[PDB]
Amino acid sequence: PRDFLKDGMQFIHKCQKPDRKEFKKVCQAVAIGFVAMGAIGYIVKLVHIPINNILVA
Amino acid sequence: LIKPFTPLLPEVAAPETKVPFNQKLMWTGLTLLIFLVMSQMPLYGIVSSDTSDPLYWLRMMLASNRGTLMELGITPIISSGMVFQLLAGTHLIDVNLDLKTDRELYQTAQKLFAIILSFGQACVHVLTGLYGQPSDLGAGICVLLIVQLVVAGLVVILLDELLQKGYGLGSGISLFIATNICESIVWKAFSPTTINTGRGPEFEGAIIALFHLLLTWPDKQRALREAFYRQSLPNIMNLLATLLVFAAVIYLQGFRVEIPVKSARQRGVRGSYPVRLFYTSNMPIMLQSALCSNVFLISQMLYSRFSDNLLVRLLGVWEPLHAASGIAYYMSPPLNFKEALLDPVHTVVYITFMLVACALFSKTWIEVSGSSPRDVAKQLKDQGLVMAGHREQSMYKELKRVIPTAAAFGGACIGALSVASDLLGALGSGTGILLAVTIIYGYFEMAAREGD
Amino acid sequence: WLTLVVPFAYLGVLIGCLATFSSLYRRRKAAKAASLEPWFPPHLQRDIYHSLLHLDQQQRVPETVLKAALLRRAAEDIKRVMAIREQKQALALLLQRGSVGDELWQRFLRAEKEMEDEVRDVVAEANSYAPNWGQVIFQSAREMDANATYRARMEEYQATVAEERAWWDKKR
Amino acid sequence: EYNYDENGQFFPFFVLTLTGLVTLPLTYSLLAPRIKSDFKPQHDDIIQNQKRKRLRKERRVKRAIAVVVGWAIIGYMVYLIIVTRRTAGSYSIGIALPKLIIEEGSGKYVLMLYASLLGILLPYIVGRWWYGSQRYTREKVLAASAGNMFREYEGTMIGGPIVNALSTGEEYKEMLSGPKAEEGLAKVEKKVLALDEKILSAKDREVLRKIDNPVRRKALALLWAYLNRIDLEDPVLNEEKYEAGSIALSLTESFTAIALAFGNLIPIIGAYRISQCIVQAISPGSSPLLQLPYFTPKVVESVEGADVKTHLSVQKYLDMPEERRRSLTVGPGLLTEDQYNSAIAVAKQLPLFAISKAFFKVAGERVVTPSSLVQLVIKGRIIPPGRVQPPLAHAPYLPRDHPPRWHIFLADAKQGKIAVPPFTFTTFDKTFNMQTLRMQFQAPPQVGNFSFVLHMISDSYMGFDVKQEITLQVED
Amino acid sequence: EGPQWKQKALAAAFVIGIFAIVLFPLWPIMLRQGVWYLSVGMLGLLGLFFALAIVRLILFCV
Amino acid sequence: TYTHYPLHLDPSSKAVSLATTGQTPAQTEAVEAELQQLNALHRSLISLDPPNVPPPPLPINPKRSAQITKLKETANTAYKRGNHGEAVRLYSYAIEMAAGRPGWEPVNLAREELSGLYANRAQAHMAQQMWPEGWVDAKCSVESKPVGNAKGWWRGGKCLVEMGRYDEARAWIEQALGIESDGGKELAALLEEI
Amino acid sequence: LRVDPVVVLVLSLCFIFSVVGLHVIAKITRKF
């Protein structure tokens, strides 16, 4: 009902939020990891498309 | 009872002394490229292609492809893990103590079950007539394809230890599924494959399309109207929505309610105990996605045979591959914004089901995982930490006042994030984005805590 | 029946490649481990004792000189093992900081094993020399080493009085 | 299922975007105080040139070829677009890659190229990165050097033999390769062995004579020539000397780490002293009065008496009455007034920590509990003998400039070993104002109270050491 | 020794059994219908248990 | 595996001398010193007893200890009589006699004997106003046994303070207090009198 | 039984190359 939502609002108001510097730093780190994995996978698939099409008759 | 099988099964040697962080990262980066290049390579003897793909909805959760060397994927590892974790939780065998030889025999049995189930899966995949026909393909290529699948299964089941035994920074299962989601995002963003559906060929990629449709099209207004938001292929708006969901979940992961605590064995030393708003992170959405995939597969396999029935028709009706007007349809997420706006009751019931299911799954998982208040308070009492209250404030009371609310709120919060990312139209399902964010965040935290 | 031997041939060549690489890598690792430099400078008392034994075989030499040589060899070995026991814990605590490579740790392990083999060999030879002469040798060896280094320190501290007397006569 | 385009229609845009997304951001890669002294040492040009050579960074050749290749690709693709766009209702998917790649002509070539790449370039570069990130250790020195120097460690050695155990490094190999040894070996050995007095070298002549590999004997003779300010007569070896200085400083850092991990008092108190002597460029065992700029062995030999076994530190020298002017500023001899004035003006600016209160204290209560976390507070004003950064070391006889650090460790006297590793810091919290310094460690679980001895040993300076005795408490 | 041989035989029988049941989709069509009927009966029993649980929950709620 | 060295036993002497050419002067002098020490040990063993096996270090032959004690006693009587010359002469003779203790015997006994002899000779030298000799004798005494030799530290500090070098005396008495009871009071008095 | 990690990586690389060689041998036998 509404008691659960009030308890959630209370838990949110009691929680301490991350600052701007920490958020920016962690976002930059996660973005670095994401871009690394994605670019490696994309390069592998792109270079493997024509080699696969030449290998398979 | 599996003592004689112990010297036969090969296991990776333990590290001599220790491994630095750079060498660990190099081991991980060198063992992941092998998994990728093996997943992109085609098998031999494949004849009958363009065949219906069974366990289609499971390929997003389980790393595999259509006809590559990784058809077995990582299913034996996770299958053995789940069955033996269920056996340990249900307490059927005496394997509960923390003895060294007991856990060694446990891991040996797990590896043996994994390899035998991998062999069984390869055999059933070959002899079911999926790649071809046993009488049509021949009697010589069948055993060759069998051994070609079993060798890859053995390679991956033995390579998992190269990440788990200590040479890797984390586990192996949480990477082979976290890399495919990033792969799908980047390939959906920079796709070079053109799709000529008439009236000029267009690019499947997002940025490639925004460049092409802008450079070789008159009426730049109509060149951007179908480049910012088009519904047929990925666009720029979906990419920006994915970026927004990513930023929001990164910011929201950090909510934690620190509690003051000072030790009592060694006076003076202070500290803090964090309880994140994402308590049991990515567990409830994972359980909900697993349940949804299981019920969808069951409904589809039942409708493929008994479509002319009453209860089957009420369970779910599929059509092109996508359920509609059924229970599985209500469990299915809305396609786009207009698809949500055409039927309000569907969106309402889906929102409510997602929220309630995620919350209740988190609440019932917090008891099985062992992080319950009655457990964590006892663990802290055993470790010696006492609440740094005003006048001997108890720990169990505040801990049991904080933990259940945190869990039952984090479940609904992550469910709402997933449903908002799905309704807004972010690239990839919300489950994929949440997994790819949470796993990377956990590994970043582990790296920051260990060294660097 | 070529269709039934083709996959067997594939498996055979794969297993052969795996084995012929594993054996080669193990041999290369063994050669690299054996190519390491010795820890401490070449032993001299052992050389003198074995030269005396060879002169005996190529012979008349008494056994008192042999007992003296064995005593000196035991003293040298006890000094070596004392140094190793002093350095073991320091190297173990230092390896965690990362300021020392692994080759030094391997050299130290090989030196410890060689010293264990040497002490076993010398106590066996000593038991062969005289009845129940296996532990008294090492008691006498440690006592002789301590007394020798103490006497050296004392002579070194005593040989300085000349400079002090000269300085006092100058300042007077 | 696919069908590659046999024209220059679709791959131009794709390759142009993919090349631009890399060549656009890569172009951005291509696009505290100092002390006051009017004294310039001999051979200023050599040491200043070495100091300038110390730092070097181009960061231009690594990415210039990449940027120029990217821009050439962009240009060629724009040309292809402009040329081909002129000449240019179902379901069919294609790829924006050329046709000659999959044709029966270049298929074998591209397959062999990919096989060779993934079978050669990957393992080679991986082994390169592996064996390239193994030789450098935490203290920025070759692992072989630390391994070779660990063995030379002895039970008790201070002053003299530390230089001998330190000269056996590895950078001297790469610094003295080829015929660079026999070019100077004879002259350097003769000068060091003859000109120096037995007070500064007593028995190290034996260790200098016994060694036979002229890549270590040359380096050790050169190190002694540096540490004595010998001014050997040729303009080619001086740069090697002032470089062996910095090499010996780095090896001194490594040796301090080793001796500290071993655990002793005399080796540590000797490693700190040899670090001070190398940074200041004075012989270990000579009078510390040579830190002033215009002093020579004659002046210090004539000011602190004819022949005495103790050495007047800088403090006791500056605290004398106005007699030193009649002692060393006469001016037919030692010095002139114009130089002595600058000597005093630079002596009145050196850091000298003088602690006044060092009492233990536990956080959370008043009496310290056995096996608890106790932090010692030490506070004393920086008074020269007469997050703020301290001025750099006044040592114009080495290439690199050294920020003066301070090491605070405390040890007992009975067993003669160290108790807690030191807490090296390099900044204060601004005669001067009242500073403060803190350091925490775990108290030992006992009931009996015992005494400690803390050391205020500092590097980059010689003669500034505070040895105070404190008493710990455990009441329970 | 005899107990070790018995345990080895039991382990071999168990691995043969699991290796046989994993190949069940290769049934010889003799016992497939009975297995399907048994699975349907188990599913019906599970559905009846779930319905009984839902009814008990609705009754306790009232 | 062993490095062979061509030896040559000398008959009727039982002393070995390295034959002519280890192709290195350093190796030559090292082997020469080693053979010198080997001849020394051989002489000791042949002078021990007809059995050439050394006895264990558990028992101690009391004759040498008795001779050392009686020499120390007569030297103490000669010193208390008033003379100091023959006193320190006989003290040095007793030190030379105690130094004849072989190495296979325990080292603590000889260490304590040399401690006593050096302390007594340092005191006798202090009675002779010979300060450097007294200082080096006190240094040898305190180097032998540093625990319990309060008189040694006291004599060293007094010799220093008398002969100058106040910094060395401060360090000496500081280490004395760090090691350390009338000895503590005497050390504190000497440190305050510095 | 134990195995060194370098052996595992070289085994995986030899596996990939063996599959590639099998494919290219099949193609060669097809074209000729």
Q: What DSSP assignment string belongs to D196-237? A: S-TTT-SSHHHHHHH---TTTHHHHHHHHHHHHT---S-SSH
From residue F21, give the alpha-carbon distance in Å to each of C57, F7, F10: 21, 10, 17
How many other β-carbons are positioned within 10 Å of the β-carbon of residue D160? 19
Question: Hey, are the CB atoms on G20 and A56 less than 8 Å from each other?
Answer: no
Chain D interface mutation, best of B167, B204, B216, B267, highest count of D Cβ atoms under 10 Å: B267
Do B175 and B423 meet the contact criterion of CB atoms below 8 Å apart? no
Single out the residue of D289, D319, D321, D291 nearest to residue D305, CA to CA: D289
Question: What residues of chain B lie within 8 A of the CB of A38, using their CB?
Answer: 182-183, 185-186
Q: Is G14 on the interface with B (CB under 8 A)?
A: no
Beta bridge partners of B194: B203, D94
Task: Report yes or no on D425 lying in a domain.
Answer: yes
Q: Is G24 on the interface with B (CB under 8 A)?
A: no
Do D135 and D142 meet the contact criterion of CB atoms below 8 Å apart? yes
Task: Report yes or no on D326 lying in a domain.
Answer: yes
Using alpha carbons only, what angle is made at residue B276 by residues B271 and B280, rounded to the nearest 5 degrees?
125
Residue with tokens 């006051």: D36
**Breaks (C–N over 2.5 Å) after residues, chain C:** 59
CA distance D470 to D419: 13
How many other β-carbons are positioned within 10 Å of the β-carbon of residue C38? 11
Token pair belonging to E10: 């039991």
Report the residue from D210, D414, D453 with minimal CB separation from F179. D414
- Residue D450 in 3-state DSSP? coil
Token pair belonging to C140: 């006498």
Q: Is F26 on the interface with D (CB under 8 A)?
A: yes
Using alpha carbons only, what angle is made at residue D216 by residues D210 and D221, rounded to the nearest 5 degrees?
80
From residue E8, give the alpha-carbon distance in Å to each of B62, B150, F113: 35, 25, 74
R_g over Cα of chain B: 25
Token pair belonging to D169: 């490094």
Are D99 and D151 in a shared domain? no
DSSP structure class, residue D460: S
CA distance D425 to E57: 67
How far, in whole angstroms, is CA D246 from its chain's centroid? 8
Using alpha carbons only, what angle is made at residue B350 by residues B349 and B352, rounded to the nearest 5 degrees?
65
Chain A interface mutation, best of G23, G24, G25, G31, highest count of A Cβ atoms under 10 Å: G23
Token pair belonging to B242: 């994915």
Question: Hey, are the CB atoms on B182 and A38 less than 8 Å from each other?
Answer: yes
Phi, psi angle pair for F74, to nearest 5°: -65, -35
Half-sphere exposure of D427 (CA within 13 A, CB side): 5
Question: Hey, are the CB atoms on A55 and G30 less than 8 Å from each other?
Answer: no
Q: Quote the domain boundaries for residue A50.
A: 1-57
Task: Report yes or no on D121 lying in a domain.
Answer: no
How many Cβ pairs within 8 Å bridge chains C and D? 42
Q: Which residues contact C43 (CB under 8 A, 6 or more apart)?
A: C76
Q: Which residues contact D333 (CB under 8 A, 6 or more apart)?
A: D298, D302
How far, in whole angstroms, is CA C121 from its chain's centroid? 12
Resolution (A): 3.8
Report the residue from F38, F103, F139 with minimal CB separation from C157. F139
CA distance C21 to G13: 12
Q: Which residues contact D228 (CB under 8 A, 6 or more apart)?
A: D192, D196, D200, D283
List for chain E the helix, strand, coil content (%; round to 5): 85, 0, 15
Half-sphere exposure of D248 (CA within 13 A, CB side): 33
Alpha-carbon gap: B151 to the closest alpha carbon of chain C (Å): 10
Number of domains in chain D: 4
Question: What residues of chain C lie within 8 A of the CB of D257, using their CB?
Answer: 97, 99
CA distance D433 to D439: 20
How many Cβ pairs within 8 Å bridge chains D and F? 14
Q: Per CB distance under 8 Å, which residues of D are interface residues toward G?
A: 111, 115, 119, 123
Task: Report yes or no on D33 lying in a domain.
Answer: yes
Q: What is the torsion angle, in degrees rounded to the nearest 10, for the CA atoms of residue C98, residue C102, residue C104 and residue C110? A: 140
Beta bridge partners of D469: D453
Single out the residue of B419, B366, B198 nearest to residue D91, CA to CA: B198
- Find the closest chain G residue to C22 by CA distance: G7
Pairing of strands D357-362, D373-379: antiparallel
Beta bridge partners of D438: D377
Beta bridge partners of D409: D455
User: What subunits touch chain F, counting only 3 or more CB pairs under 8 A?
Assistant: C, D
Do C72 and C144 meet the contact criterion of CB atoms below 8 Å apart? no
Q: Which of D328, D348, D368 is at the close of a domain? A: D348
Q: What is the torsion angle, in degrees rounded to the nearest 10, for the CA atoms of residue B170, residue B174, residue B178 and residue B179? A: 60
CB burial readout E25-39, b (16+ within 10 A) else e = eeeeeeeeeeeeeee
Query: Where are the domains positioned within chain G?
Result: 1-32
Token pair belonging to E3: 């107990």
Q: Do chains A and E touch (3 or more CB pairs under 8 A)?
A: no
- What is the sign of the dihedral through the CA atoms of C155, C156, C158 and C163? positive
Q: Which residues contact D48 (CB under 8 A, 6 or more apart)?
A: none
Question: Hey, are the CB atoms on D102 and A49 less than 8 Å from each other?
Answer: no
Question: Hey, are the CB atoms on G7 and C21 less than 8 Å from each other?
Answer: yes
How many other β-carbons are positioned within 10 Å of the β-carbon of residue B101? 9
Do D170 and D244 meet the contact criterion of CB atoms below 8 Å apart? no
Question: What residues of chain G lie within 8 A of the CB of A55, using their CB?
Answer: 20, 23-24, 27
Question: Hey, are the CB atoms on F178 and D309 less than 8 Å from each other?
Answer: no
Q: Which helix (DSSP H) or strand (DSSP E) does residue D470 occupy?
A: strand D467-471
Question: Hey, are the CB atoms on G30 and A57 less than 8 Å from each other?
Answer: yes
CA distance B370 to B376: 8
Q: Which residues contact F45 (CB under 8 A, 6 or more apart)?
A: C64, C67, C68, F52, F54
Are D184 and D197 in a shared domain? yes
CA distance F69 to F122: 18
Q: Is B22 on the interface with D (CB under 8 A)?
A: yes
Contacts 24+ apart (CB under 8 A), C30-34: C33/C106
Q: Which residues contact B326 (CB under 8 A, 6 or more apart)?
A: B299, B313, B314, B315, B316, B317
CA distance D434 to D424: 20
> What are the DSSP calls for B380-415, one per residue?
HHHHTEEE--SSS--HHHHHHHHHHHHHHHHHHHHH
Using alpha carbons only, what angle is made at residue F9 by residues F3 and F13, rounded to the nearest 5 degrees?
145
Using alpha carbons only, what angle is made at residue C88 by residues C85 and C93, rounded to the nearest 5 degrees?
145
Domain with residue D154: its CATH number is: 1.10.3380.10
Single out the residue of D293, D272, D254, D227 nearest to residue D460, CA to CA: D272
Using alpha carbons only, what angle is made at residue D260 by residues D401 and D372, rounded to the nearest 5 degrees?
110
Q: Which residues contact F77 (CB under 8 A, 6 or more apart)?
A: none
- Residue F16 in 3-state DSSP? strand
Q: Is G2 on the interface with A (CB under 8 A)?
A: no
Question: Hey, are the CB atoms on B4 and E11 less than 8 Å from each other?
Answer: yes
Do B254 and A18 meet the contact criterion of CB atoms below 8 Å apart? yes
Alpha-carbon gap: D444 to the closest alpha carbon of chain C (Å): 20
Q: Which residues contact B85 (CB under 8 A, 6 or more apart)?
A: none
CA distance C140 to C137: 5
Question: Hey, are the CB atoms on C14 and B151 less than 8 Å from each other?
Answer: yes
How many Cβ pairs within 8 Å bridge chains B and E? 35
CB burial readout B117-132, b (16+ within 10 A) else e = bbbbbbbebbeeebbb
Which amino acid, residue B369? S
Report the residue from B4, B121, B124 with minimal CB separation from E26. B124
Q: Do chains E and C touch (3 or more CB pairs under 8 A)?
A: no
Q: Is A24 on the interface with B (CB under 8 A)?
A: no
Residue C73 CB-density burial (10 A; 0-12 exposed, 13-18 middle, 19+ buried): buried
Report the residue from G6, G18, G22 with minimal CB separation from C25. G6
User: What subunits touch chain E, counting only 3 or more CB pairs under 8 A?
Assistant: B
Single out the residue of A52, D344, F49 nearest to residue B67, CA to CA: A52
Single out the residue of B122, D223, D245, B1 nearest to residue E12, CA to CA: B1
- Find the closest chain D residue to A49 by CA distance: D95
CA distance B294 to B91: 25
Question: What residues of chain A lie within 8 A of the CB of G24, using their CB?
Answer: 55
Q: Do chains F and A touch (3 or more CB pairs under 8 A)?
A: no
- What is the sign of the dihedral through the CA atoms of F162, F167, F172 and F174? positive
Token pair belonging to D73: 């690709």
Q: Quote the domain boundaries for residue F119.
A: 62-193
Phi-psi domain of B428 (left: phi exceeds 0; alpha: psi -120 through 50; beta: other): left
Token pair belonging to D349: 């600016």
DSSP structure class, residue D360: E
Question: Hey, are the CB atoms on F178 and D414 less than 8 Å from each other?
Answer: yes
Query: Helix F25-48 vs helix C45-57: angle between axes, to the nearest 10 degrees?
Result: 70
Beta bridge partners of B256: A16, B276
CA distance D337 to D330: 8
Single out the residue of B390, B192, A47 nearest to residue D12, CA to CA: B192
DSSP structure class, residue B423: H
Q: Which residues contact B390 (CB under 8 A, 6 or more apart)?
A: none
The alpha-helical segments, DSSP class H, found in B206-257 are 207-215, 220-228, 236-253
Do D227 and D280 meet the contact criterion of CB atoms below 8 Å apart? no
CA distance D280 to D397: 7
Phi-psi domain of D231 (left: phi exceeds 0; alpha: psi -120 through 50; beta: other): left
Task: Give the C window 5-44 contacts with G, CB below 8 Å.
Answer: 10, 13-14, 17-18, 21-22, 25
Token pair belonging to D101: 């790649």
CA distance D41 to B18: 49
User: What subunits touch chain C, counting only 3 or more CB pairs under 8 A?
Assistant: B, D, F, G
Question: What residues of chain G lie within 8 A of the CB of B155, using their CB?
Answer: 11-12, 15
- DSSP E strand stretches across D31-159: 92-95
Q: Is D364 on the interface with B (CB under 8 A)?
A: yes
Residue C61 CB-density burial (10 A; 0-12 exposed, 13-18 middle, 19+ buried): middle
CB burial readout D93-110, b (16+ within 10 A) else e = ebbbbbeebbeeeebeeb
Task: Report yes or no on D331 lying in a domain.
Answer: yes
Q: Is A43 on the interface with B (CB under 8 A)?
A: no
DSSP structure class, residue B276: B
From residue C26, give the alpha-carbon distance in Å to each of C22, C30, C32, C120: 6, 6, 10, 29
Do B157 and B12 meet the contact criterion of CB atoms below 8 Å apart? no
Sheet holding D373-379, edge to edge: D357-362, D373-379, D437-442
Contacts 24+ apart (CB under 8 A), C33-41: C33/C106, C36/C103, C36/C106, C36/C107, C36/C110, C37/C107, C38/C111, C39/C107, C39/C108, C39/C110, C39/C111, C39/C114, C39/D151, C40/C80, C40/C83, C40/C111
- Find the closest chain B residue to D444 by CA distance: B266
DSSP structure class, residue C149: H
The alpha-helical segments, DSSP class H, found in B91-131 are 100-127
Token pair belonging to F20: 């002519």
Task: Give the C window 16-75 contacts with D, CB below 8 Å.
Answer: 39
Phi, psi angle pair for D465, to nearest 5°: -140, 130
Half-sphere exposure of D394 (CA within 13 A, CB side): 21
Beta bridge partners of B202: B195
Question: Hey, are the CB atoms on B141 and C102 less than 8 Å from each other?
Answer: no
Phi, psi angle pair for F37, to nearest 5°: -65, -35
Half-sphere exposure of D247 (CA within 13 A, CB side): 27
- Find the closest chain C residue to F108 by CA distance: C147
Single out the residue of C67, B42, C34 nearest to residue A53, CA to CA: B42
User: What subunits touch chain A, counting only 3 or more CB pairs under 8 A?
Assistant: B, D, G
Half-sphere exposure of F43 (CA within 13 A, CB side): 10
Query: Where are the domains positioned within chain E?
Result: 2-61
How far, in whole angstroms, is CA B2 from its chain's centroid? 32
- Find the closest chain D residue to A48 by CA distance: D114
Are D325 and D373 in a shared domain? no
Are D163 and D268 in a shared domain? yes
Q: Is F168 on the interface with D (CB under 8 A)?
A: yes
Report how many helices (DSSP H) and strands (DSSP E) chain F contains, helices first.
Answer: 8, 2
Q: Which residues contact B347 (CB under 8 A, 6 or more apart)?
A: B334, B340, B423
Token pair belonging to B177: 């599924």
How many Cβ pairs within 8 Å bridge chains C and G? 20
CA distance B229 to D97: 26
Are D372 and D475 in a shared domain? yes
Do D238 and D45 meet the contact criterion of CB atoms below 8 Å apart? no
Do B293 and B315 meet the contact criterion of CB atoms below 8 Å apart? no
Do C77 and C119 meet the contact criterion of CB atoms below 8 Å apart? yes
